[PDB]
Copies of this chain bind each other. A is one copy, B any other.
Amino acid sequence: RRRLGVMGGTFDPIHNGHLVAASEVADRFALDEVIFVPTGQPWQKQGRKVSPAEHRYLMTVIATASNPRFTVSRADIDRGGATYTVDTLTDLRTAHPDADLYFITGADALASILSWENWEQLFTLAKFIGVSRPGGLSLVEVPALAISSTDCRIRAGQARPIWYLVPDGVVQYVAKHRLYS
């Protein structure tokens, strides 16, 4: 029976902290594969103009291509409308009927899981892993999550470098598509 990580996030942009965290969780929980799932998002979020879903999807593919055990799923961006994790996990249970699912996202996101739709079903579909920076549900501290997507966007908007914060290839993709500037 396979152990499948599900790395859910808006990924605007994906950055090296996300990749460190997925790598650590896969090793710690002996996961066979980690499926990255970019969230579906409208044009605006928390006072924020979220990059179009295709761009966030492509950046996540670029960032994960070199890892033999990472893949990327369009399940949330192609569902249409708002993402509810119960729908994410239902879709992946259908696609991988014989795998145990481990849902991985930021601990600050999972703090509100009892307010997520259908929280009762969530805990029947997967185990949950919250990754956090230092300072039912398992918590994993990841120093590299000091890197945040918000800081990456701020720097890119200010024409300041995001090399090494963000994977090679993603940096150039951000710049040539002018995602944040």
Evaluate whether A169 and B23 lie within 8 angstroms (CB atoms) in the complex, with A135-B135, A143-B146, A143-B151 already known: no
Any chain B CB within 8 A of the CB of A97?
A: no
What's the nearest-Cβ distance from chain B to residue A104, in Å?
A: 15
Number of A residues, CB within 8 Å of B = 39
How distant is the Cα of A16 from the Cα of B19 in the complex, in angstroms?
13
Copies in the complex: 4
A143 nearest in chain B by CB position: B146
What's the nearest-Cβ distance from chain B to residue A13, in Å?
A: 12
Q: Give the residue of B62, B68, B133 whose beta carbon is less than 8 angstroms from that of A61.
A: B62
Q: List, sorted by A's number, 15 A–B pairs whose CB atoms are closer than 8 Å.
A: A16-B164, A20-B165, A23-B161, A24-B160, A61-B61, A65-B173, A66-B168, A67-B163, A68-B172, A71-B176, A135-B135, A144-B164, A164-B167, A168-B168, A169-B169
